Every structure is written in C-alpha cells, then in structure tokens.
Design a protein around this ligand. Structure first.
Ligand SMILES: C/C(=C\COP(=O)(O)OP(=O)(O)O)CO
Ligand code: SF4
Length: 309
C-alpha cells in the first residue's frame, strides 16, 4: 500500500499563534489561564492545555474576577468582549487576524445602518462572533448557509447591501452561494471573491490533488473542526472513502484492507505529531514510506502579542 501526504496540511498561521498565546500565558502567569471556547478545535491540543492548567469556558460568568482570559482563535462577539471589559479581567485576544479582518467590515456596515449578509454555518463560534459584530437595529445582519437560504431572504434595502463569509467554508459551495446572492441582489458588495482564508483554500486544493490519487483519504482533525470536515467532505464528493479521525487509534483495518493507495491530510488545527502517528499505524497495516505530494509553499506567520513573548 502506498501512503501519500497532502501538501499543505496541518497547522495554519492563526492556529499556531493562538496555541502559543495560551502556552506563553501559562508560562508567564501560571495556572489557571481561562480561555473562552476551545482555543482551536482539536481534542489533542485542548486536552494537553487542560493538563497544563488552562480552563475552557463558554461564558464570561464562569470566569472569577482578577483572572486572565484568552479569546479563542475563532473570535468573539462585541457583547462578549464588552462583558469581559466590564469585568476586572486581564484579556488577551487569540482571534486569528484573518477573522478580525471580517469583523471590522461587519462593524463598519453596522455603524452605517446598512445591512450585511454572512455566509456560514449556524451555531459555529466564528459565525456567532462575526454576526455579533452587528448591533444597529436600523440595518440588519442575516445568515445564509446555502443558495436556498438566499432564494428566501428579503432585506430592507438591497441598494445598500454587503456580504462576508466564514473563513473555513467549502470553496466550491461558497461560490454557489455568492452566485445566488448576486442574481438576487445585483447591487450587493463584497470582497473580490470571499473571506475564505489562504489555509482553507490551500488545504482544499491539496486534498483535491490527494483524492485524485488515493482510494481512501484520512483527515486528521476533530469532529467540531469546520475546516477539517470540509476536507473529508471534498474527498467524499470525489467518490473516495474519507474518514475524519482524531488519531491513529480511530483507524479501522477494513477502511484500508487491500487498498493500494491511501492518502493522509490534516485540518488547520491538527498537530503534525498526530499525522506521524497515523502514518506509523498505516505502515503497520502494510503501508510503505510516506510520500509528500508537491504543493503550494505557505510562508505567512502571525506573531504573538509582545506582552506575551
Ligand atoms: C480559528 C479557525 C480555524 C482553525 O481551525 P479550527 O478547527 O480550530 O476551527 P474551525 O475550522 O473554525 O472549526 C477559524 O478561522
Ligand atoms: S484557518 Fe485561516 S482564518 Fe482560521 S486560524 Fe487558520 S489561518 Fe486564521
């Protein structure tokens, strides 16, 4: 059995920054360090940080006065931010810069009383934080997840309308949604394409190349990782069996028995060690040396704030 590795795969600039923020805060201030939501959606990372004294909470009420609070890489709403500011908390923000970029545009439309539409998945923390940048009752903030949602949406003033997107969406499905938005609201304004980040676009392009060779694709990532699910989904739609897994122990022999080519990739929040362990398991199951596919070289890095270096 041949083992192929997608490239790029694994950690993106925002996830590496956000994890370092929490690690550095624990070294500087000691336990406990409060973190609003899993810093990144990865069980291995989260479990480890708990171990070292990080405490993960959903609501600011859970945090004692005098505490240090870190906002997750997915971002938070202005309401949450202000609730944290009204309290006597020391706050560090691990929101990824590429999510903050979107937030700034939503706040601008809110200040103008002009409506905005967000393409994304209901209930996800990044969608809660981005929708949570809009607070003007004169305008409006609407969420659409599909073309059918666009077909049913009515707004107050489609002459002054703009859109934004979640950073981890399917590139292909978002394209369909935007096509619909432009047909329904011909004066709608947005970015040149969408707010899907470089890491999401690159991992999806890489898994596409991987799936065209591999019969089976294993995506290292947790169940609640949006971007990771998009990678398994993409391979599955190409007609390949694809499994989202947290670690090598999740691999069932049936998935790769008699398979000549198995591909491995990892979501933006999954540490490289998990991929190494998955490769080791596939080798014990008959696989040879892991072969990295050629890919788009990534070079962006986001530094931790100086106060945590
Ligand atoms: C922070 C972030 C992505 C990094 O991976 P995560 O798996 O942590 O988050 P997501 O894909 O949104 O479920 C959203 O920009
Ligand atoms: S997936 Fe993109 S936007 Fe999200 S943390 Fe990573 S680099 Fe930032």
């Amino acid at each position: 059995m041949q083992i192929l590795l997608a490239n790029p795969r694994g950690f993106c600039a925002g996830v590496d920054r956000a994890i370092s923020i929490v690690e550095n805060a624990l070294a500087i201030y000691g336990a406990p360090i409060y973190v609003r939501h899993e810093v990144v959606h990865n069980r291995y990372v989260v479990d480890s940080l708990r171990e070292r004294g990080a405490i993960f909470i959903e609501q600011i009420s859970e945090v004692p006065d005098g505490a240090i609070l870190i906002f997750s890489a997915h971002g938070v709403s202005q309401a949450v931010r202000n609730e944290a500011k009204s309290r006597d908390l020391t706050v560090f923000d691990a929101t990824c810069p590429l999510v903050t970029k979107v937030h700034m545009e939503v706040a601008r439309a809110s200040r103008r009383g002009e409506e905005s539409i967000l393409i994304g998945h209901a209930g996800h923390p990044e969608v809660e934080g981005t929708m949570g940048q809009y607070s003007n009752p004169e305008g409006g903030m609407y969420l659409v997840e599909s073309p059918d949602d666009v077909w049913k949406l009515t707004v107050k003033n489609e002459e002054k309308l703009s859109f934004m997107t979640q950073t981890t969406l399917s590139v292909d499905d978002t394209s369909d949604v935007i096509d619909a938005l432009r047909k329904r609201f011909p004066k709608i304004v947005g970015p040149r394409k969408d707010d899907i980040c470089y890491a999401t676009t690159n991992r999806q392009e890489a898994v596409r190349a991987l799936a065209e060779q591999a019969e089976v694709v294993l995506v290292v990532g947790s169940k609640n990782s949006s971007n990771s699910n998009r990678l398994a989904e993409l391979a599955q739609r190409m007609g390949k069996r694809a499994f989202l897994i947290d670690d090598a122990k999740d691999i069932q022999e049936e998935w790769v028995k008699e398979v000549k080519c198995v591909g491995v990739t990892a979501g933006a929040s999954a540490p490289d060690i998990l991929v190494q362990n998955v490769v080791a398991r596939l080798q014990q199951l008959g696989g040879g040396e892991a072969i990295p596919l050629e890919g788009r070289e990534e070079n962006i890095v986001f530094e931790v704030p100086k106060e945590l270096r």
